């Protein structure tokens, strides 16, 4: 791939993205869709071997079956009211094609079988644009549908997410299926105070995708994409490792790390609208993905793994990865639980 | 509803279960989605056409293009899987498990 | 410090926090009425924007 | 009878899509969702849309070309299947056919039809406009303005398809 | 005698961990295959529907 | 304002003091992102790049003045929208006629 | 939208199609034009949580002209009282009907 | 399950229970007919007859573990004159995970299958008569 | 401008610097068969760059002051140590064999580096293609486990896939018996332990393995050691060869971009050097490591990234 169809290929996906959230009519919202579909799949295919074509064709029947369901729910809204504007949708039936036509593209559970075999086949990088930008558009559209959303199916979906993204992660020792499960369960506390306060959706979902984008760039500075060739980030990079404790930590929402922000205000709001059984559920289950976090932290920075001699080689030579934006996104992975309040500015 | 929508309807419902349900051919299943644009395309038509509403007339139209695309991209898939294993089979697709 | 600005520095704490405590009330049950009623600036919830509806003569007079 | 023509169409409709969704060789899927595609062409035409229907159908028609040239590339074997031959296939074919007979039959028995969602079986010559006398057609006047009106649907469309070549070179290029 | 049998047994930490253990077995053992989880995605549906009436 | 960061009845409000506890800190965390920057590339901490840790405190506190600005705005909209539909709505928020403890009763639970 | 970038920038990328009471090409009106603007014009301005409960009436009769249930259904019950009382040698059509 | 649901709670605790037995016996098979069906989908039996099989022993087991419930819970209540007790319901959530331990053989399951079952069965009870919602309405 | 995307953009495109003089050669042999100096030789006469043969050491030389480190920063692997004690229980041998591929490795990626980025091409003495001659010797002789063998092609299957074989192989073969004298004559006491069977090992890897291996791909010369006296003869044969086979012919830009940008960053070529296989030869705990790397930093000029090291006379280092 030419650098220059690479940055065209790139600002298209962020195209499709941009289409379906400034898009006040149904037809540009699934163009957009399908624009970014278009131009993610070359992104998967980016290194060619067989893994990698499995996980785009398995990402392409997904994301495939799932716009069929949402333009089959758009036409539906269209027989029932005559309109084709972007809001509630005006038939029970197309509300619920619509919400599992996007439970798919988010990869939500039990729609999720995709998202860790997806994110194992391709990448890094390719896997740090699915697990973060590819979930901006979904989310946007559940935004402006939520009113017409059925209750019982959306909580469902976050529940079970919640529990399947908890339990998937306990097994995994690669590093991008770990991603994946831990992706599925953040999902879940997204969509879960979705019909309570959309503005903690947001929150939740900008959280997220700061902690995620820090792991996956601390992921790529080293190389690493298994437990194992992560456990010796300790014998080069010793500041490494302690970042991606910091990180872990905060993912896993341990207070007063940025993560347990979200977390957070998301049992505020639900139990202002007298929901206390479903928040208490939540929080005890996300347990789940603090023990396989902390595992991670157990070998990658509180204990020394064993090395191999040829790592004295790589003593000599400095990190020349990007690692854009690292700095950055690390320190407001952990240090902004004392801004919390400045969360009004989504409203 | 209208008898004709009836018919419609389960043609998408026949095809939507058409693609769920795998056989081995991977080029099966690219038909049943091909299935659904059409009847969705047909759909769509009968509703814009019926209510006159004159600017729609190109919202069918709109729909083949990205059904072009998806076919096109879907076959490009199914050159690299058979390039790589020698047919289209699905079953074929399961290193990631 | 003496006893009488420990006091009154109390009693001005009291004063803030009863006051906060209260709008906190108040806003629970002013998003209560608003979301039930739709009156008001919260959950407004947008419909279609009536000026995109076309009042010109059209091709035939019944419409 | 002639009346019912679009329903009658619509029954062959669905039949097309029985026969693909059975999922036979993709020979005889190309075959089903060409029929599918014909009468799909005839279900639009009588709502009015000439230029709707026979595009639908000439797309589709150069689809399965491609369809057909790979399927003997990389979706053949040495027996291919037909719907007889294949207890899975006719399986799926005779449960799809019956299901339609069904719905078929109580709808014209009732003029009604209750499947998950009412319908009715008046026929649907029912619901057509009764005034007309312009002097075009409206879905061309509809189609025509994409070029006036659609001016952001050409840019997105035709961005798309740009895209859609760079990106199957760029999937197939191993 | 059984009484504390329950509240240990239950509740032991070798008890709660060593049932997320099988859940993680049964949520992770899977085939790997586009055939069974398009499969269920069609039993989700169904049951949705009959079931839990999310479309209604 | 539709799709606007700071909408224009947002001057009416003081503006955030630029010795903001809150903007303090925020320059604090570019602080932080700056030293973490030399670290992670493997340069002197404290001494490396003076140029670039200039640039890192700035612009932290360049954003954060705008993020206090507009978090600052919504509530105070909050506010006013909360206040003027109490006035709206006289009906559904009552004075309350505050009895005094004189006056009411309380069972008392002795802590025996 | 989620971002109203053409509210701000004034441009007009696809609100045009969003309604069959907008300008269509020639002023060819939709046949549902009436009721759709009248329910737009009842539910303009008051929000979806008002306008379920305020609007009814217009959304009904709105939603009789985009599918004619009541109406096919009160055919129904004519033809199927005609079959009834023809077949039992009770009434006879007029020459025009 | 609405409606299935709604019955069982229409009927007065304590009384007629072959109508509550059969309620969470109803409620009991659907439970395991969607764990087969699953089970089945994701891990394919071998053969069509396992596949009844399987279907058999899941269906069985959840059917049985709804009508022990609801015969204990109601039996129970019936005895002790005490309908609206959380109690009730504790001894029908303990016999429901013995019938899981002895259909699993394994006292491990069910001492354990005892003590979740049974505490969850009473917080059920407690939720109804208390009115707590599991998927609260928006309110605010 | 450092190398990457942009710079390609812009127009620094490796054909645009391409000639008939751009080529990799690699000369080979068994030992004491006149490598070095026939490498020297056929680099002088064409102008081409002379990569002395990967050692112990090579890393060394190409980072810091280029001097050899102490031997505790290569895990004491000794070629002394592994002339004396072939089989000892340490794990020399092979972690003597896996530290010299890397080196080789590294070498490669250092070699092709220049060879696109400046046009000007290169002569190496032996390479990772031919590194495994010594592997099969080791191992035929009892001097490694048939698992330290499978380790060695593990990281070679993942690393060797990345990168073009050498434009021209160059193979001076000597007759074992001749070999042996020459290792007397050398005066070296520990290399004059090396066994005749093992030689003979490397001339049966060499002439059975490699050399057929590299035609498929590769102009293999071929030379006795009279032809290999006079270096004149042999670039008379180079300069006037096709180059009608092998994968060069294939490259173009864009692959060569990819390329370039695989062999300047060192660590993503290291990376699978050191995959987590726990072998006892080449395996070290944390105490050990942990231990050795705090000396490492301690080095002079070691502990910051090159250029920000003031105890060793770098300036402006609060504006870097
Ligand atoms: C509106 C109305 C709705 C509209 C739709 C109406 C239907 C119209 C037809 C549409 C086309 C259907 C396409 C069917 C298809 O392609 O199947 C391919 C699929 C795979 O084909 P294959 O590759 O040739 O494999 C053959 C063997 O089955 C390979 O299996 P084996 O070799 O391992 O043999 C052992 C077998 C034995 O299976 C068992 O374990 C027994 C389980 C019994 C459970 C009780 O194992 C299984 O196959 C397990 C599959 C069980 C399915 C899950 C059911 C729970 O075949 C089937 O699974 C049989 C289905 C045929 C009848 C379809 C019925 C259509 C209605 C579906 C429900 C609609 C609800 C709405
Ligand atoms: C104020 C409001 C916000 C409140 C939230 C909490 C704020 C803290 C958030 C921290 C954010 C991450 C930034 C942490 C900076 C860590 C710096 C450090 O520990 O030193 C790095 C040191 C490097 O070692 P060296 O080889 O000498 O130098 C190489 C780099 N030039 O590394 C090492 O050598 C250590 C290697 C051994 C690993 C030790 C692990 C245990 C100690 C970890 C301490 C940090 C814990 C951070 C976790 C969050 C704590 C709240
Ligand atoms: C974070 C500092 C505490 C460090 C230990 C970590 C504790 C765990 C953090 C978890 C979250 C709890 C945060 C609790 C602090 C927020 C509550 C608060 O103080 O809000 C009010 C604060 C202004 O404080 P105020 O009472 O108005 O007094 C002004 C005096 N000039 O307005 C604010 O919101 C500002 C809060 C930011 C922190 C204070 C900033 C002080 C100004 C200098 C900048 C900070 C530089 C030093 C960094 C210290 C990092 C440890
Ligand atoms: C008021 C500050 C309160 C701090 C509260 C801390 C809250 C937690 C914040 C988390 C973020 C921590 C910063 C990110 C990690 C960077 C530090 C690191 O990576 O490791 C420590 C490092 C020493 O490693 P080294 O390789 O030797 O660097 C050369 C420095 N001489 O670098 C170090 O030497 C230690 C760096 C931390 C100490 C900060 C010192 C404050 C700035 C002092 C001004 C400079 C004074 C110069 C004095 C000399 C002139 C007299
Ligand atoms: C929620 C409340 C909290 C709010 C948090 C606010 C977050 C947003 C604020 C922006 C965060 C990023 C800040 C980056 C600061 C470091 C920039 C720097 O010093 O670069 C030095 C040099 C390039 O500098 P130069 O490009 O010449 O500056 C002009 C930019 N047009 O080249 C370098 O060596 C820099 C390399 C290290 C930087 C990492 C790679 C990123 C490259 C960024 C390019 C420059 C960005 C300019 C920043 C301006 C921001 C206003
Ligand atoms: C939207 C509304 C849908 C409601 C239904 C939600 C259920 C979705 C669950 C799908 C993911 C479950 C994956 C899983 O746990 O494994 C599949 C499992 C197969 O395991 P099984 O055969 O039952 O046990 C073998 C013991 N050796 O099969 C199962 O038994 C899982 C059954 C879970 C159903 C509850
Ligand atoms: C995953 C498979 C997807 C298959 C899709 C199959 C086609 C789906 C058709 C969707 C439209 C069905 O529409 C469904 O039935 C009729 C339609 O008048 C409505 O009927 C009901 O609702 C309306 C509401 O005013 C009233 O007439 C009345 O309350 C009742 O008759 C249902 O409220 C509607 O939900
Ligand atoms: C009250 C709520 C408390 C919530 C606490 C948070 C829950 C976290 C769950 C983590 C469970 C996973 O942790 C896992 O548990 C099993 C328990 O059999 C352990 O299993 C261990 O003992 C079992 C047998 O007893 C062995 O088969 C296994 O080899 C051994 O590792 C695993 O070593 C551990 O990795
Ligand atoms: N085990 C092992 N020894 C090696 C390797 N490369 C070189 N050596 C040894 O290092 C020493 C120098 O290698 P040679 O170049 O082949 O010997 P030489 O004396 O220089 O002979 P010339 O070809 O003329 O240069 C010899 O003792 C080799 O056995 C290697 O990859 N593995
Ligand atoms: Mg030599």
Redo the contacts with the bound molecule.
Sequence with gaps: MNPIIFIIILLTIMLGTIIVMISSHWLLVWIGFEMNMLAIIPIMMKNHNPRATEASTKYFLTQSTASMLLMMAVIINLMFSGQWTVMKLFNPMASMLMTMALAMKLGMAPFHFWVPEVTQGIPLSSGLILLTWQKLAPMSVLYQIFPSINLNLILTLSVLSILIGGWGGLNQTQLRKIMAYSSIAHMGWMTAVLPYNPTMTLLNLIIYIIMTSTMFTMFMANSTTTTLSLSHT?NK???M???I??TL?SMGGLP??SGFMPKWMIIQEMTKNNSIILPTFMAITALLNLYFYMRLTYST??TMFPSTNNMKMKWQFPLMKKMTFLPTM??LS??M??LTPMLSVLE | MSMVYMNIMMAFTVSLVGLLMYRSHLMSSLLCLEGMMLSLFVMAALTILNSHFTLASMMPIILLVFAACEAALGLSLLVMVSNTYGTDYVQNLNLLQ | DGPEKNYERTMAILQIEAEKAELRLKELEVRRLMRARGDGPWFHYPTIDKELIDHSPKATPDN | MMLYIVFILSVIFVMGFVGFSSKPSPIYGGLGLIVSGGVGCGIVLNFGGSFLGLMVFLIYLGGMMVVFGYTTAMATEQYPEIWLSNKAVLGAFVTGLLMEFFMVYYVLKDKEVEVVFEFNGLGDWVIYDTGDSGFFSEEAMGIAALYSYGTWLVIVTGWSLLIGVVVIMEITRG | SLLDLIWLEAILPKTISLAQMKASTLVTNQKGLIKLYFLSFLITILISMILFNFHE | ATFQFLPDEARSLPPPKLTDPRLAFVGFLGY?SGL?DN??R?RP?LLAGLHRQLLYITSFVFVGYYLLKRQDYMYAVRDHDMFSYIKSHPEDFPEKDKKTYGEVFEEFHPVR | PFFDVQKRLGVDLDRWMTIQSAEQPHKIPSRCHAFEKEWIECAHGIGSIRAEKECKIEFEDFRECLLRQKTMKRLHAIRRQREKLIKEGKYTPPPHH | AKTVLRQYWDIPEGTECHRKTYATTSIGGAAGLVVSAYSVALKTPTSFLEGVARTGRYTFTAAAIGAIFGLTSCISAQVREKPDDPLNYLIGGCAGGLILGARTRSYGIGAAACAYMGLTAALVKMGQLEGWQVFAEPKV | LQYGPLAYILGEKATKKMTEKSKLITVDGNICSGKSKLAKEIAEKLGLKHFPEAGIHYVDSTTGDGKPLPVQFSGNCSLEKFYDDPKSNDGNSYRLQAWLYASRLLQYADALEHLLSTGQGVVLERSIYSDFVFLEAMYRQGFIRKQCVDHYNQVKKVTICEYLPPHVVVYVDVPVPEVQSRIQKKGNPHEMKITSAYLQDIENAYKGTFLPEMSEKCEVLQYSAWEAQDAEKVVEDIEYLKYDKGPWLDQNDRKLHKLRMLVQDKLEVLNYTSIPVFLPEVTVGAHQSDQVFQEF?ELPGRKYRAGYNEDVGDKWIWLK
């Design positions: 300790w990079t010793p500041i490792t302690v970042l404790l910091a930590l007063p790390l920075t509180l690390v320190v952990t240090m639980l004392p | 932080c973490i670290a992670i493997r901490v | 930093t």
